[PDB]
Design a protein around this ligand. Structure first.
Ligand SMILES: *C[C@H](O)[C@@H](O)c1ccc2cc(OC)ccc2c1
Length: 247
């Protein structure tokens, strides 16, 4: 990984020590980026819901994961599941359980710095993974992209700033998430998010990551070329809000 500081340095260390999974998945990959493009063709709003119990903002929420996943299977284009333990209160066990219970694409959200974490995602039943430009070098990103693709997964490349964008465009990413929150402070900057979105070619599948609470924001972003919308913890509190967001 890169030279990091603070909580990012910490999670990367936790990721390096985490045991591998030695298990076999029980359904083939279902492509999230392709399902988004299908939704776009059909003029259906494509929302990725998050199952996320904690994050560094101080979020703390509990609920039945299967109840949530089964509800979201009826409305969301896919599910993001946080598996990082210390800051997100996630677990591989929860990923494994949810993946076995629903038939929509599942993105595993963690801090991937080693190939075995991609094996883990695959073996636990995830359909794809996020890769975070801020924790990886250019060379690592290219390596991990290629490795994920060898399993049939197209990772979501997450960017926060223009430096990350420049790298994302060099590495041959096909599916990019543009984050609203600054990694270090948590501050939301929508002017920055929109500028980065405007700089990505239209053939990349673009996901606006967080900063969204209203259908009108989705409509504005869709007009600017965003393909799908990754909503934050507001759905962990009020799942039925998703119905209002999809029209
Ligand atoms: C996708 C990512 O985990 C995002 O949900 C997120 C939530 C909260 C948060 C807080 C920060 O500082 C307080 C920094 C980043 C951050 C990201």
């Amino acid at each position: 990984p890169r030279y990091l500081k603070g909580w990012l340095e910490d999670v990367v260390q936790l990721s390096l020590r985490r045991p591998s999974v030695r298990a076999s998945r029980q359904r083939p990959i279902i492509s999230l980026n392709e399902r988004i493009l299908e939704f776009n063709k059909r003029n259906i709003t494509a929302i990725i819901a998050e199952y996320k119990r904690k994050d560094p903002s101080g979020l703390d929420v509990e609920r039945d994961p299967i109840e949530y996943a089964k509800f979201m299977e009826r409305y969301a284009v896919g599910l993001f599941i946080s598996t990082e333990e210390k800051y997100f209160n996630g677990s591989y066990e929860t990923l494994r359980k949810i993946a076995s219970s629903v038939s929509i694409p599942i993105l595993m959200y963690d801090f991937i710095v080693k190939e075995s974490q991609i094996d883990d995602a695959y073996n636990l039943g995830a359909d794809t993974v996020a890769l975070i430009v801020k924790i990886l070098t250019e060379r690592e990103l290219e390596s991990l992209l290629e490795y994920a693709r060898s399993y049939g997964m197209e990772p979501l490349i997450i960017i926060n700033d223009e430096n990350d964008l420049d790298i994302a465009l060099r590495i041959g990413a096909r599916f990019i998430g543009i984050a609203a929150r600054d990694w270090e402070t948590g501050e939301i900057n929508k002017e920055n998010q929109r500028k980065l979105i405007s700089m990505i070619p239209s053939n990349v599948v673009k996901v606006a990551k967080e900063g969204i609470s209203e259908r009108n924001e989705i409509e504005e972003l869709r007009k600017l070329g965003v393909n799908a919308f990754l909503i934050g913890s507001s759905l962990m509190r009020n799942p039925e809000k998703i119905k209002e967001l999809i029209e």
